[PDB]
């Protein structure tokens, strides 16, 4: 009845979406082929119903290179997806935002926009867009920019939520990573309501310590991020003692036109053998979620101040003990809020306990907490990325590639100055000021 | 999808190609007759990139084999693994260039180059979406260096928006197979620099060290020596031939590893390299692969990085193996060897992971590194060339086929100019 | 009871008619041999019943060359057709309008007319004529123009509908199409109630893109044509909640005596494997039919105005959503009507779902939409074709074949200015005028 | 139904026909004896067009074989495939024309032409509905060129409302089989232009290159040389002999390809051509047919279309094959080769499709394109003729049997006039 559509861009987007839609299929009790053996609406939010008993997702898979889309076609989820949406080009952007935004990006953007319009007109009470894309990827960044511009032009005032993949400080897999990051962030700073950040090194630390897995393939990381996505969406997808919506998320998290860069966290993340020797109480999971060693962005909030917080509890939950835990964490010393935000908390509750996938790394739980914090600890990450980009650009490396692929110098200069101003404003707002 | 054309010039090209297509045949389960006899269907999902489907399940390759003398084609044609090539591709001349630049670029190369340009254009239209050109040639001989440079110029003008890779064999520093090495090298490089995108500078006698020491072989023949070159040839382009968790492609490498148009001379490397007898006592794991890769001992070019720095590095892993330890070990190498990287290029490492392991091995890695150590490789060649040309030796018949003395003036005035920026960037701040 | 006869001329008409009459027996449950295994009339308007249980069609197959008719006699549909009607000459016209209209047309025109009066007297409530003729060929252009003169005088005011085959702009089978087309249109402009336009290059895109077939032989292409043909007369043969007769479209789609050139369109056209993942609702097939990528003539309607429209639904259709879906089309701005046509739609419903022939490309479907819009977008088709012919006549190419076969040079000038007059009037009426 | 009459004149016509009717025999599945031994009834539905049904299920060709000397009939009659011809059709003279125009037109041709016209009229009445005449002659010999145009005039006056096709063999530019080539050609063509609807200008040595290059046959004999001519001969007339999705007929080709009465000189073309050894490595697919058809070198006339433009272009496909790709391909050919088409004739393509493949091949196509490059073919002949006629060489042997000086005046004044009109159209606006 309130319809939200998901756009998955790049190889990271496609894999994360595969994991996320798998998790949705287990959550709503639907078989991979579309049949099925509080519950029934819920699936009408995502799974559009066809003439027969089959249900089909509202997903729009788009890529330039065809290999990953061929893989997802050949995967076990071959019947579920509607074959038309799997849009593939012929060659990738090869970590070139110029290629992914100007040269080839305009030859397929018309088709993806046509499919978006078809799906959005198909639904009734459209809510918004969820964009699953990376930052290092050239196609990811270019299509992110292009699709943000096109969707903002077409649909005026709707929710546009992004689940990015922040570049890691020490872990690195690209060389034009600072260029891609600066360009995409400058382009999509003004065209997104609220953009979450996820980093791979942080997830690797979490999986190494909290879950104690020595062989953490990308499947486990994708499973984790899918769990956060499902937790944030379960409020719309299910009924609870206190519901919360995407507009609620925006209006309670982001206070300013530019400062809309929160970070996600999930709890509890404990292993299988350690499940038996733990109690899993509301207060203890709340403390674990607020623990700085569980955050999924490699930035310790001890260097900064929390500015806004939203927590969704799901499962059997009592609002009294939720209140007690929130009050004691508010009165704790190490967590420090801003002076001009006397109330910095937003609580939501859901009656549906999370369900664990078969063969997954996590264990079955009766209570789950998802946390989304808008803080100032992201300023250090912005500063580090800006410093890396400036150091790389000081002697004009790869600029010949970028300029040859239809660029100029004003774009780089304006992106640099724009992120300098954004970091300055972020720090000035986050820091305490007299009066 | 994203097909690339294989071009072989000189005697090395067919000798390398005769063993290169041997490797590709085993990977895709292709019988020598040319008929698919494999079992897994994953290899056939992307088979058009190298081979081409034909009538009655034939898989003739997209290969162009050209030489100036019939002394090389008769070996591959009469010998095994010649039954799958199309005889139209077997382009050959009448007499060799005789290790002459002019006799491979001006006099006789004019009429031969028109025949090959027909077949490549014929092959290009048969392709679905051309991705680039993959060339194999030698920088020491005449036919491989002479016409191959000429063919690049003609291909470049016709297809300007396409990439190409040249797997050139740099002349050996210590030993000189041919008396006139420097004259051929500087004339080819002066024409290669402005009309190519990415070259892999490999070496002849540098390969001799690895097989004798690391592989402990006493009699390394050209059959075994070329096999190692094929492995680092089939690993660079295996990313688009097979699925992976973090894929790469020919254009992806060129974007990351070419900071400037002139600085596009590379340095390959392969790992692991263990003999048949000593492979039982080594645990084939991710850790040692990176350590066995970055050391100066296991390098395919006669260059010591201890005298230079790594500008950019790309490593293409293979096989079923996790990625967490790939970066944690890459960070350790980046930290432990921090003195051996360029300061103004942070996080100068690119990584990519395939899914199918090489034949008879659980995992392997291929290292390509754009380094400054090539600076001394050209100086040694330049030093040898400037000594001989001063005496005006061996050029009494170079001028006889159109080329003139003033041609040397620009060729040498750029090699010292190219090495000037190739070196001034290392100490640049 | 109300009877219409079909005249199929040329290999275009005969090949279309081979699959055209393939469909009617399937619709009415008629075995190829005439036996049988809403109902009970159904077939009495097409299948003139004979003494025995056999039913024979009411078709008049005529051609000059004896080639194309030969396989009809030797095909699987041998017993169904009555052996007398298959009129054949001895040699074709060789894409020569003059040969098929003056020299060899007359020596056989008196034989087809004999079978017309024979069949027109056999029926009681004769309604009109169906013509299946192309434009490029000789026997399909010159010969059928002779019929339009012969049927008009014999029967003053009856329905005369033509299902032409418009020559394609880029696709060109013949070399003298600009000579055959302009000569045909000028003579048959004043002797046609309405002429549905079909282009050959347009059906490739429909089969390649919408249906996703890489080998579209004429067997599969002609199948997509008989569906509209069986759609125009789908209300005479079956009872519906809102019936339409052949004079309805004739009255609703002809604002002026000259402007009577509509263009067909069919929907839904979807593949077999894609059927399971489509909802196939009344609301979308109205939009699916109207999209400019689904029309069967290579002329995008966005360049012009919709003079009028006409829709014929069928199956389990409810007249409310038809009212709802049609109403919202006026709001959407890909449609653009003329000022003097505030009401510009006509709707017809039927209770018989369409039936798919076994072995065909289409899949079983419960609904069908067949739009016939007279629109200004066809004005570019005449002007573009008029440019080609005007280039030929500049240096009198190919003329000597025409003049020596019984036509004058003066006749060519009259056909040239006639298309200029039609183009001027059609654009002037289509464009707005003062007061 | 629409029967065709085959006329063979000269030694070439007999030799071409001796292998032509072999091709027709295989297509319709008749034994050398003359009795049907086929399997499919699709062949017999239209058998009267070429063969004639006789008593006791025997078929006889509707062809007449005539020459001024008895040597050629002695070969065909004594050899195989001579037992199916009706012995009445074998017309022979007493002595050859000796490569003399007058002896083949006035002296020794006057008495023979009356005998052959009887058999022509006798065969025509046996026909149901005559469609046209096929004539195969030579433009270099005496009897084929001399009498051949004499028979054309006799047939033309008595059947005026009928079509005919001549498969003339243009003399070779590089090699001259007979010393007096130009005199025969310029006299015959001047008589050919007035009363011939359409001609196929093929060449001899231009077909030497085709067999040597693709078929890689080192020794092309006339037995194999004429086989490719028969395939072009059979491909034109298989449209009305067999069912097709889009049929063509002899009247359709003439109207589509003759913009003006004087411009009816053609260039044929056949595809695909593949040797037995190298046919396994080529995928027989419709895209390769059109590209192999249009390249200038694979032409049956010794005239490269690069120096000229295509007025109109035909294409007669064969065999089971889809219609879309041939439809869209010739647009791509038209788009890519847009500079080589006449501006004032857009969409200058006629396409036709049959439904029966040739023997031992999945599909094939035939190209017949009226090009302007014929202009260079006639200019050479006119240039050669005007050089010899100035010296009056060999003239005293021609004028002694009826001809005289000013007879050559109109023939030369027509060639330069025709070539002028043939030239002032490609540059006309
Ligand atoms: N979280 C997560 N991130 C991934 C995963 N796979 C790849 N990535 C990230 O994606 C980045 C690669 O960029 P991509 O968007 O995949 O680029 P691509 O798909 O190859 O297409 P191009 O950008 O044109 O080359 C890497 O830096 C990774 O950090 C994954 O499985 N999980
Ligand atoms: N890697 C490798 N290199 C080889 C092999 N055989 C020869 N070479 C190199 O190829 C060079 C031979 O020169 P070519 O370019 O082949 O010259 P060519 O083919 O003999 O023709 P000409 O230049 O006219 O003599 C030698 O200098 C070797 O360094 C081989 O088996 N493997
Ligand atoms: N839609 C469709 N069109 C066809 C088909 N077959 C032929 N045509 C069209 O018919 C045109 C040829 O002209 P025709 O009127 O059929 O010629 P003909 O019927 O053989 O009569 P002649 O002109 O005398 O030879 C071509 O341009 C095609 O576009 C078919 O199967 N389906
Ligand atoms: N294509 C082809 N042409 C041939 C063949 N044999 C001969 N010719 C041509 O026929 C010409 C011979 O002239 P003809 O017309 O046959 O003369 P003739 O039959 O010998 O009688 P005379 O003119 O009196 O000598 C030669 O110039 C050849 O070009 C053949 O086997 N194939
Ligand atoms: Mg990619
Ligand atoms: Mg050599
Ligand atoms: Mg016809
Ligand atoms: Mg003779």
UniProtKB/Swiss-Prot annotation, chains A, C:
Positions carrying 3'-nitrotyrosine: 276
Binding residue positions for GTP:
65, 93, 134, 137-140, 173, 177, 200, 218, 222, 246
The molecular function GO annotations come to: double-stranded RNA binding; GTP binding; GTPase activity; structural constituent of cytoskeleton; structural molecule activity; ubiquitin protein ligase binding
Q: Which compartments does it reside in? A: Cytoplasm, Cytoskeleton
| One GO term (biological process) | mitotic cell cycle
List keywords of the entry alphabetically: Acetylation, Cytoplasm, Cytoskeleton, GTP-binding, Hydrolase, Isopeptide bond, Methylation, Microtubule, Nitration, Nucleotide-binding, Phosphoprotein, Ubl conjugation
Name the cystine pairs: none
Active-site positions on this chain:
248
Summarize induction of expression. Answer: Autoregulated by feedback control of mRNA degradation. In excess of soluble tubulin, TTC5/STRAP cofactor triggers cotranslation degradation of tubulin mRNA.
Query: Known EC number(s)?
Result: 3.6.5.-
Q: Which reactions is this enzyme annotated as catalysing?
A: GTP + H2O = GDP + phosphate + H(+)
Maturation and modification: Some glutamate residues at the C-terminus are polyglutamylated, resulting in polyglutamate chains on the gamma-carboxyl group. Polyglutamylation plays a key role in microtubule severing by spastin (SPAST). SPAST preferentially recognizes and acts on microtubules decorated with short polyglutamate tails: severing activity by SPAST increases as the number of glutamates per tubulin rises from one to eight, but decreases beyond this glutamylation threshold. Glutamylation is also involved in cilia motility. Some glutamate residues at the C-terminus are monoglycylated but not polyglycylated due to the absence of functional TTLL10 in human. Monoglycylation is mainly limited to tubulin incorporated into cilia and flagella axonemes, which is required for their stability and maintenance. Flagella glycylation controls sperm motility. Both polyglutamylation and monoglycylation can coexist on the same protein on adjacent residues, and lowering glycylation levels increases polyglutamylation, and reciprocally.
Q: Where is this cross-link: Glycyl lysine isopeptide (Lys-Gly) (interchain with G-Cter in ubiquitin)?
A: 320, 364
Main localization is cytoplasm
Q: Record's GO cellular component, any one?
A: microtubule
Residues the entry annotates as binding Mg(2+): 65
- Omega-N-methylarginine found at: 333
Name positions with the PTM Phosphoserine. Answer: 42, 226, 433
Q: What is known of its domains?
A: The MREC motif mediates interaction with TTC5/STRAP and may be critical for tubulin autoregulation.
Which family, according to the similarity comment?
Belongs to the tubulin family.
- How does the record describe its quaternary structure? Heterodimer of alpha- and beta-tubulin. A typical microtubule is a hollow water-filled tube with an outer diameter of 25 nm and an inner diameter of 15 nM. Alpha-beta heterodimers associate head-to-tail to form protofilaments running lengthwise along the microtubule wall with the beta-tubulin subunit facing the microtubule plus end conferring a structural polarity. Microtubules usually have 13 protofilaments but different protofilament numbers can be found in some organisms and specialized cells.
Annotated protein name in UniProt:
Tubulin alpha-1B chain
From what organism does this protein derive?
Answer: Homo sapiens (Human)
Curated annotation (Swiss-Prot), chains B, D:
Q: Name one GO molecular function term.
A: metal ion binding
Which amino acid positions bind GDP, per UniProt?
10-12, 15, 99, 138, 142-144, 177, 204, 222, 226
Please give the annotated consequence of changing residue 302 to T.
In CFEOM3A; affects heterodimers formation; results in increased stability and reduced dynamics of microtubules
Describe the function of this protein. Tubulin is the major constituent of microtubules, protein filaments consisting of alpha- and beta-tubulin heterodimers. Microtubules grow by the addition of GTP-tubulin dimers to the microtubule end, where a stabilizing cap forms. Below the cap, alpha-beta tubulin heterodimers are in GDP-bound state, owing to GTPase activity of alpha-tubulin. TUBB3 plays a critical role in proper axon guidance and maintenance.
Provide the positions where the record notes the PTM Phosphoserine: 172
Any idea what this protein is called? Tubulin beta-3 chain
Linked pathology: Fibrosis of extraocular muscles, congenital, 3A: A congenital ocular motility disorder marked by restrictive ophthalmoplegia affecting extraocular muscles innervated by the oculomotor and/or trochlear nerves. It is clinically characterized by anchoring of the eyes in downward gaze, ptosis, and backward tilt of the head. Congenital fibrosis of extraocular muscles type 3 presents as a non-progressive, autosomal dominant disorder with variable expression.
**Cross-referenced InterPro entries, in alphabetical order?**
Beta-tubulin_BS, Beta_tubulin, Tub_FtsZ_C, Tubulin, Tubulin/FtsZ-like_C, Tubulin/FtsZ_2-layer-sand-dom, Tubulin/FtsZ_GTPase_sf, Tubulin_C
Quote the Gene3D superfamilies the UniProt record gives.
Helix hairpin bin, Tubulin/FtsZ, C-terminal domain, Tubulin/FtsZ, GTPase domain
| Tissue specificity as recorded in UniProt | Expression is primarily restricted to central and peripheral nervous system. Greatly increased expression in most cancerous tissues.
Q: What PANTHER family would the database entry show?
A: TUBULIN
| Taxon lineage | Eukaryota, Metazoa, Chordata, Craniata, Vertebrata
Name of the gene: TUBB3
PROSITE patterns documented for this protein: TUBULIN, TUBULIN_B_AUTOREG
What's the PTM story here? Some glutamate residues at the C-terminus are polyglutamylated, resulting in polyglutamate chains on the gamma-carboxyl group. Polyglutamylation plays a key role in microtubule severing by spastin (SPAST). SPAST preferentially recognizes and acts on microtubules decorated with short polyglutamate tails: severing activity by SPAST increases as the number of glutamates per tubulin rises from one to eight, but decreases beyond this glutamylation threshold. Glutamylation is also involved in cilia motility.
What does the entry's domain section say?
The highly acidic C-terminal region may bind cations such as calcium.
What outcome is documented for mutating residue 205 to K in this protein? In CDCBM1; does not form tubulin heterodimers; patient fibroblasts show no major alterations in the microtubule network, but the microtubules are less stable than wild-type
- What keywords tag this UniProt record? Cell projection, Cytoplasm, Cytoskeleton, Disease variant, GTP-binding, Intellectual disability, Isopeptide bond, Magnesium, Metal-binding, Microtubule, Nucleotide-binding, Phosphoprotein
* Co-factor requirement: Mg(2+)
* Residues annotated to bind Mg(2+): 69
Q: Which family does it belong to?
A: Belongs to the tubulin family.
The organism of origin for this protein? Homo sapiens (Human)
Residue positions of motif MREI motif: 1-4
């Amino acid at each position: 009845m309130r319809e939200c559509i998901s756009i998955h861009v790049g190889q990271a987007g496609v894999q994360i979406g595969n994991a996320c839609w798998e998790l949705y299929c287990l959550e709503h009790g639907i078989q991979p082929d579309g049949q099925m053996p509080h519950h029934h609406d819920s699936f009408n939010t995502f799974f559009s119903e066809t003439g027969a008993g089959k249900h089909v997702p509202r997903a729009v898979f788009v890529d330039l290179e065809p290999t990953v889309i061929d893989e997802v076609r050949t995967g076990t989820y071959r019947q579920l997806f509607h074959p038309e949406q799997l849009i593939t080009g012929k060659e990738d952007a090869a970590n070139n935002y110029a290629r992914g935004h100007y040269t080839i990006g305009k030859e397929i953007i018309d088709l993806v926009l046509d499919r978006i319009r078809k799906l959005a007109d198909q639904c009734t009470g459209l809510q918004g867009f969820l964009v699953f894309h990376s930052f290092g990827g050239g196609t990811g960044s270019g299509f992110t920019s292009l699709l943000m511009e096109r969707l903002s032009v077409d649909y005026g005032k709707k929710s546009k939520l992004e689940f990015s993949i922040y570049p890691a400080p020490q872990v690195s897999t690209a060389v034009v990573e600072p260029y891609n990051s600066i360009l995409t962030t400058h382009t999509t700073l003004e065209h997104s309501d609220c953009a979450f950040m996820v980093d791979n090194e942080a997830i690797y630390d979490i999986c190494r310590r909290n879950l104690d897995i020595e062989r953490p393939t990308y499947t486990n990381l994708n499973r984790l991020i899918s769990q956060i996505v499902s937790s944030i969406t379960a409020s719309l997808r299910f009924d609870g003692a206190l519901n919360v919506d995407l507009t609620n998320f925006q209006t309670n998290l982001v206070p300013y036109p530019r400062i809309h860069f929160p970070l996600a966290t999930y709890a509890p993340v404990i292993s299988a053998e350690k499940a038996y020797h733990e109690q899993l109480s509301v207060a203890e999971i709340t403390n674990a979620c607020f623990e700085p060693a569980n955050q999924m962005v490699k930035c310790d909030p001890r260097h900064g101040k929390y500015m806004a917080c939203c927590l969704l509890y799901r499962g059997d939950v009592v609002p009294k003990d939720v209140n007690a835990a929130i009050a004691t964490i508010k009165t704790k010393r190490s967590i420090q809020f801003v002076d001009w935000c006397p109330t910095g908390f937003k609580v939501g509750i859901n009656y549906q306990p999370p369900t664990v996938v078969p063969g997954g790394d996590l264990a079955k739980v009766q209570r789950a907490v998802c946390m989304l914090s808008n803080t100032t600890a992201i300023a250090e990450a912005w500063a580090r990325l800006d410093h890396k980009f400036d150091l790389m650009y000081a002697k004009r490396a790869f600029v010949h590639w970028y300029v040859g692929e239809g660029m100029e110098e004003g774009e780089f200069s304006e992106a640099r100055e724009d992120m300098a101003a954004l970091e300055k404003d972020y720090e000035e707002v986050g820091v305490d000021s007299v009066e | 999808m994203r097909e690339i054309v294989h071009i072989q010039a000189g005697q090395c090209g067919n000798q390398i190609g005769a063993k290169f297509w041997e490797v590709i045949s085993d990977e895709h389960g292709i019988d020598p007759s040319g008929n698919y006899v494999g079992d897994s269907d994953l290899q056939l999902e992307r088979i058009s990139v190298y081979y081409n489907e034909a009538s009655s399940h034939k898989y003739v390759p997209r290969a162009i084999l050209v030489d100036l003398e019939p002394g090389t084609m008769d070996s591959v044609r009469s010998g095994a693994f010649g039954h799958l090539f199309r005889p139209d591709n077997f382009i050959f001349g009448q007499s060799g260039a005789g290790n002459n630049w002019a006799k491979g670029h001006y006099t006789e190369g004019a009429e031969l180059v028109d025949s090959v340009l027909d077949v490549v254009r014929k092959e290009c239209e048969n392709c679905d979406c051309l991705q680039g050109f993959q060339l194999t040639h030698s920088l020491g001989g005449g036919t491989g260096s002479g016409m191959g440079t000429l063919l690049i110029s003609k291909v470049r003008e016709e297809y300007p928006d396409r990439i190409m890779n040249t797997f050139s064999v740099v002349p050996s520093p210590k030993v000189s197979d041919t008396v006139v090495e420097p004259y051929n090298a500087t004339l080819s490089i002066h024409q290669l620099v402005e009309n190519t995108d990415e070259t892999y500078c490999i070496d002849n006698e540098a390969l001799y060290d690895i097989c004798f020491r690391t592989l402990k072989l006493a009699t390394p023949t050209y059959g075994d020596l070329n096999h190692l070159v094929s492995a680092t040839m089939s690993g660079v382009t295996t990313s688009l031939r097979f699925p992976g968790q973090l894929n790469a492609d020919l254009r992806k490498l060129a974007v990351n590893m070419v900071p400037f148009p002139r600085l596009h001379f590379f340095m390959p490397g392969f790992a692991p390299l263990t003999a048949r007898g000593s492979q039982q006592y080594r645990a084939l794991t991710v850790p040692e692969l990176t350590q066995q890769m970055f050391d100066a001992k296991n390098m395919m070019a006669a260059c010591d990085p201890r005298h230079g720095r790594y500008l950019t590095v790309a490593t293409v892993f293979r096989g079923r193996m996790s990625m967490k330890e790939v970066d944690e070990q890459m960070l350790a190498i980046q930290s432990k060897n921090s003195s051996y990287f360029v300061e103004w290029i942070p996080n100068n490492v690119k990584v990519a992971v395939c899914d199918i392991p090489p034949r008879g091995l659980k995992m392997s890695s291929t290292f390509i590194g754009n380094s400054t150590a090539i600076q001394e490789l050209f100086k040694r060649i330049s030093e040898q060339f400037t000594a001989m040309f001063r005496r005006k030796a061996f050029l009494h018949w170079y001028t006889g086929e159109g080329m003139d003395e003033m041609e040397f003036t620009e060729a040498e005035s750029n090699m010292n100019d190219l090495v000037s920026e190739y070196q001034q960037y290392q100490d640049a701040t």
